[PDB]
Paper text:
Neuroligins are postsynaptic membrane cell adhesion molecules that connect presynaptic and postsynaptic neurons, mediate the transmission of signals between synapses, and shape the characteristics of neural networks through specific synaptic functions. NLGNs belong to single transmembrane proteins, and they all consist of a large extracellular, acetylcholinesterase-like domain (CLD) and a carbohydrate-binding region, following the transmembrane region of O-glycosylation helix and the C-terminal intracellular region as postsynaptic density zone (PDZ) recognition component, which mainly binds to postsynaptic target proteins such as Gephyrin and postsynaptic density protein, thus promoting synaptic differentiation and strengthening the stability of synaptic space and the function of transmitting intersynaptic signals. The ectodomains of NLGNs can form specific cross-synaptic connections with neurexins (NRXNs) of the presynaptic membrane, and these connections can be regulated by the membrane-associated mucin (MAM) domain-containing glycosylphosphatidylinositol anchor (MDGAs).
The interface area between NLGN2 dimer is about 744 Å2, which consisted of interacting residues (E429, H607, M434, F433, A599, Q592, L604, A439, W438, and Q596), among which E429 and H607 form salt bridges, and other residues mainly contribute hydrophobic interactions. The extracellular domain of NLGN2 is a cholinesterase-like domain, which might be required for synapse-specific functions. The overall structure of NLGN2 and NLGN3 protomers is very similar, with root-mean-square deviation (RMSD) of 1.518 Å over 522 Cα atoms. However, when chain A from NLGN2 and NLGN3 was superimposed, the orientation of chain B from NLGN3 has a rotation relative to that from NLGN2, indicating the distinct arrangement adopted by different NLGNs. The structural alignment shows that the relative rotation of chain B may affect the interaction between NLGN2 and MDGA1. The interacting residues were mapped to the previously identified patches A–C. The results intuitively showed a slight difference in patch B, where F408 of NLGN2 was substituted by Y431 in NLGN3. Sequence alignment shows that NLGN2 also has the corresponding arginine residue at position 428 in a conserved region.
Residue numbers in the entry:
A (entry chain B), B (entry chain A): 42 to 149, 175 to 392, 401 to 552, 563 to 609
Write the structure that this text describes.
C-alpha cells in the first residue's frame, strides 16, 4: 500500500474489520497537509509543506495538539458520553505537541470525500477517537479526520492588526485546498467535498459557506445539532478575555499591540492551562468577525443572499439539555429567572417576559404534579438553543432557491439512566452514524447492543452517503419501516422527517413553541 | 278556583294542557303585589297595596309597563330568537301602561316557589312571553313571572339625593316579601324561594345575595349565562347619561337636583323614547352602587365574605357571541384592535396585549385556512364575557364553605343557520327548560321538534326542580345517557358537567384560555 502525491511518496497500511459483513479497509494515518507552526510563525496563517525523496513511513496515530481534559470545562456544550466516561477519553490523546497539522484518511476513481470537522466546544477533541472505517467501507466512501489549531492558540483575534483572521478556519481551509489539489492520486473527486460535523464543530460548517475562500473547494454541507446563529457560535468579546490569560502569565502591557511579541515564545503547554471561564452559554475562543473570512455577521450576511446554492442538512436530537436540570413551585420559579437574566442580551423590560414564559411552558390541565416541572425545563433549553435557531436557518436558506432538509432523531442505545424518559440528550447520534453497534461495542461507547440497533445504522449510513454522492439522500439506493421518501423543507409547510424509531414523515415540528420563540418574543423587546 | 289572602279575595282559572302526559294546571294571571306608582311617587320606592271586599276578577295577561321594541336596541345582549323573530315578539306586549306592578302564578302544602326574573338588557321583556305551565305541572312546582320597573324609569340614581337606591331591585324585593308573607294561602313555602333567571336578568340574581334586605326572603339562586362582575352588569356613569335624555325633552338645569321635579310629571310614553345609546358592551340603566342595596361593588364586597351560604349554580352555553362576527389576514387583525381598545378600561401599555392575544388565538399548525379566523373570533368574545368571569365567581364562592355547581350546554333544536357549526349562541337553552318541545312548537319558537329533543326536557326539568326542592339536583328522583352524578365545583379540580348532547362528567373546562384571561393578563397592566 504505497502511493505518491505531488509532495512526494507515502506508504500506508490495511486492516481486517471485526464484523463478517465488511472487507478490505485501507488506512493512511498521519499524512500531512501544511507546514507546522514552530514558534516563529505562531499566531500566523499557514503555508504549504516541503517535499521529500523516497518513502514516508506514515501509519500511527499522530499527536494531537495540546488540550487539557481536566480543566473545569463547560458541561453543556460537550456531549454526554464524552463527559461521563471522561476517564476513557482522557487515555486517548496522551501524546500532544504544537505540531498537529496532519490528517487521517481511509481509502476503501473519483470517490466522494467526507471531511469530518470534529465537535466539542473548540477546546478539545480529535479525529483519533472517531476512527470511522466501518463508515468508510459500508457506503464505499473516503473519510478524513484532520486536526487543526484548537484551544487557546487556535482562533486568535484581538481588535488590532497583531491578530488577524481566525487561523483555525483558514487552517482547515488549507486542508480543504490540499484535498482539492492532491486527491486525484488517492482516487477522490476534488469536486465532491462534503464537509460534515457535529456539536459546535458543525457551527463552523455554516461559517465556511458564507465566506469567500471556500469557492472552488467543496460543494455541500451537513449540520448536526449546530448553527452559526446561536448563543455560543461566535465570539463577540475577544479583547476582554485575550487580556486575562495575559494577566496570569504576564503580557498585559497597556500598549495595545504588546501581547503577541511575548507570548509567541511562551511554550504551548503553559499557554493552554489558563482558566478562561466564559460567560454562561457563551464561549471564549471561537471564530470572530474580522473581514476576510467573516466579513459580516451571519445575522446580516445571511440575509443578503451572497452565499451560493449549496444544500445544507439541519438536524436536532429530540431531547437534549439533560444537563440543564440534574420540582417545587419556587424551584421551577428559580431557573426561569436566572435563565432569562443570563441569556437575553440584558435589555430593560424583562418583568413581562419571565411571566409569559412561565405561563407558556406550564400544563394547566394538571399543574400540581412534580413531573411537569423538571420535565418542561428540559423542554425550555432544548428549544431556545437547538430547536429554534434551526428553523430560522432552514426558511431563509430555502427561500433563495436552495434545497434544505431536516430530521429529528429519537432512539438511543439503552444504558444506565437512559429510559424513554431520557431521549438522545446531546449525543447518541454519533455511535449510529459511526457504526459502533455493527462491529461490536468499543471502549468509549459502553452499552448493550442488540439486533434492533443494528438496523438503524444501515439507513443512517445510506442517507449520509447517498447524500455525499448526489445530495438527495435516496436516489441511488434504497428499521421497522422502509422506503419512506426523504421530504424537503420549504417555507410554506415545514415538513420534518423523524428518523427516529419508526420513520414516519410528519409535519411542522412544534409549531407553537417555534412560533413563540421566533415570531412573538422579538416584539416584547 | 277562588282563594283568599290577607289582602282580600281573588279568583282564578284552570286550563287543559296540550300534551297527553300532563294534567290539571291552574293559573292566576295578574294578581298584585304592591301599590302602583302613579306620578306623585314616581322615581320613588314602593309600598304595600290596599285591601278590597268581595272577589277580584284577575285572569288576563296584565299590561306590561312601557317598552319599545323598535328602538335600535343592542344586538349583543339580547338572545337570538328574540332578535330574529322580532315581529312575533312585538305582537305580544301591545298594551302598556305605567301600572305594571303585578305578577302571574301557576298552582299545580308548602311547595317551592320559582320566581323568574326575566332577562333582556334591562330595556324590554316580560313574563307574559315565558308562560311556563308545562314547567309548572311536570316537576310539580309553582312559577311566578312578575313585572318590575324596567327601562328608563326603572333603576334610577344620579349621584345626588334626588334619586336614591335602585328602585327596580327593591321593587322586586317588595314582591319577594309579598311571596314570603302571603303564600301560605296559595300552598307555597315562604322558606324555599329560589330566584332564577337568564341573560342579564341573572346578573341581578347575584346582586340580591350580596345585599342585606334579602335576608329572610329567599334561600337559593340560579345564574344562567350571567354574572355580577361582567362588563355590562352594573352602571358606572349614571350622571353623564341621566343628563342626556333631559337634553332632548328638557330638564338639564345646571342646578344638580333640578331634573326629577320636571320629569316626574312627564308622561311615561315620551320618557321611554330617547336614544340613550350606551358605550360598546356597556349599559345605560342598570343597578348602581349607592349604599343601601349595593353598599360596595361586587368586585370588593364579594371578597370580604359577608354573603351567607346560599348555593349558586353558574352555567355557560358553549358557543355564544355569534353576533360578534356576522377571514383575511387584515380582517382578523381589525376586530382584535378595536375590540381591545373598546373593552379594556383604556390604560397605557396596549401594544403588547393585542399581539399576545393575536398569537394565543391562532392555530399555527394550519394558519392559512379561512375557517380559523371568523371561528376563533367567535371563541374570543365567548371567553372574555361569559366563560371567564364565571369561574372567578365559582372559585371564590366555593372557598367560603358554600356549594357552587356548573354545567355547559351544547345541543340545540336544528333550524335555519343552526348546524353543529352554530352552537347554542346566547339562547336555545330557554325552550328546553320551558318545555316548548313537549307540548308542540309555539309561535315565537319556530323549529322542527323531534323525539330526540323531548328527552332533554325531562332531565333539564328534573335538575332545575329537584334543585329548588333540596339544592342538590339529583337526590329525590333520577338523553342517550342516564344516572351521571351531578359533580360539584371546588378550587382544586374544577369539574364541569356537560349537560349537552351526551352527559359525560368531564373536567377543567378550557384550562388554557381560562388561565390566560384570569391569571396572566392582570400582570400586563
Amino acid at each position: 500500500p504505497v502511493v505518491n502525491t505531488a509532495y512526494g511518496r507515502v506508504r500506508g497500511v490495511r486492516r481486517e474489520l471485526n464484523n463478517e459483513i465488511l472487507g478490505p479497509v485501507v488506512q493512511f494515518l498521519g499524512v500531512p497537509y501544511a507546514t507546522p507552526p514552530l514558534g516563529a510563525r505562531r499566531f500566523q496563517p499557514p503555508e504549504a509543506p516541503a517535499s521529500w525523496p523516497g518513502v514516508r513511513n506514515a501509519t500511527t496515530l499522530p499527536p494531537a495538539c495540546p488540550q487539557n481534559l481536566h480543566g473545569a470545562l463547560p458541561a453543556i456544550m460537550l456531549p454526554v458520553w464524552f463527559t461521563d466516561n471522561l476517564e476513557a477519553a482522557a487515555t486517548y490523546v496522551q501524546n500532544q505537541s504544537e505540531d498537529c497539522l496532519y490528517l487521517n484518511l481511509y481509502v476503501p476513481g473519483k470517490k466522494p470525500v467526507m471531511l469530518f470537522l470534529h465537535g466539542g466546544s473548540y477546546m478539545e477533541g480529535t479525529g483519533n477517537m472517531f476512527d470511522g472505517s466501518v463508515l468508510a467501507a459500508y457506503g464505499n466512501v473516503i473519510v478524513a479526520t484532520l486536526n487543526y489549531r484548537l484551544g487557546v492558540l487556535g482562533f486568535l483575534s484581538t481588535g488590532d492588526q497583531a491578530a488577524k483572521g481566525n487561523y483555525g478556519l483558514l487552517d482547515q481551509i488549507q486542508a480543504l485546498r490540499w484535498l482539492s489539489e492532491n486527491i486525484a492520486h488517492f482516487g477522490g473527486d476534488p469536486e465532491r467535498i462534503t464537509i460534515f460535523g457535529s456539536g459546535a464543530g458543525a457551527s463552523c460548517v455554516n461559517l465556511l459557506i458564507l465566506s469567500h475562500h471556500s469557492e472552488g473547494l467543496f460543494q455541500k454541507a451537513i449540520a448536526q445539532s449546530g448553527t452559526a446563529i446561536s448563543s455560543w457560535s461566535v465570539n463577540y468579546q475577544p479583547l476582554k478575555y485575550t487580556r486575562l490569560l495575559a494577566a496570569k502569565v504576564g503580557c498585559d502591557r497597556e500598549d495595545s499591540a504588546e501581547a503577541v511579541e511575548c507570548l509567541r515564545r511562551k511554550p504551548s503547554r503553559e499557554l493552554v492551562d489558563q482558566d478562561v471561564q466564559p460567560a454562561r452559554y457563551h464561549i471564549a475562543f471561537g471564530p470572530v468577525v474580522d473581514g476576510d473570512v467573516v466579513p459580516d455577521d451571519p445575522e446580516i450576511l445571511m440575509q443578503q443572499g451572497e452565499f451560493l446554492n449549496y444544500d445544507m442538512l439541519i438536524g436536532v436530537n429530540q431531547g437534549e439539555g439533560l444537563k440543564f436540570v440534574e420540582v417545587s413551585a419556587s424551584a421551577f420559579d428559580f431557573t426561569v429567572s436566572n435563565f432569562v437574566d443570563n441569556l437575553y442580551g440584558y435589555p430593560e423590560g424583562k418583568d413581562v417576559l419571565r411571566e409569559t414564559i412561565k405561563f407558556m411552558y406550564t400544563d394547566w390541565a394538571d399543574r400540581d404534579n412534580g413531573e411537569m416541572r423538571r420535565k418542561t425545563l428540559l423542554a425550555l433549553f432544548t428549544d431556545h438553543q437547538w430547536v429554534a435557531p434551526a428553523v430560522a436557518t432552514a426558511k431563509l436558506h430555502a427561500d433563495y432557491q436552495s434545497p434544505v432538509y431536516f430530521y429529528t432523531f429519537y432512539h438511543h442505545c439503552q444504558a444506565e439512566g437512559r429510559p424513554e424518559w431520557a431521549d438522545a440528550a446531546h449525543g447518541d447520534e454519533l455511535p449510529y452514524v459511526f457504526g459502533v453497534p455493527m462491529v461490536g461495542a468499543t471502549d468509549l461507547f459502553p452499552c448493550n447492543f442488540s439486533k434492533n440497533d443494528v438496523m438503524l445504522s444501515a439507513v443512517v449510513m445510506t442517507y449520509w452517503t447517498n447524500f455525499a454522492k448526489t445530495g438527495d439522500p435516496n436516489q441511488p439506493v434504497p428499521n421497522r419501516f422502509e422506503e419512506v421518501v426523504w421530504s424537503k423543507f420549504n417555507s410554506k409547510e415545514k415538513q420534518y422527517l423523524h428518523i427516529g424509531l419508526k420513520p414516519r414523515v410528519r409535519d411542522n415540528y412544534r409549531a407553537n413553541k417555534v412560533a413563540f420563540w421566533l415570531e412573538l418574543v422579538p416584539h416584547l423587546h
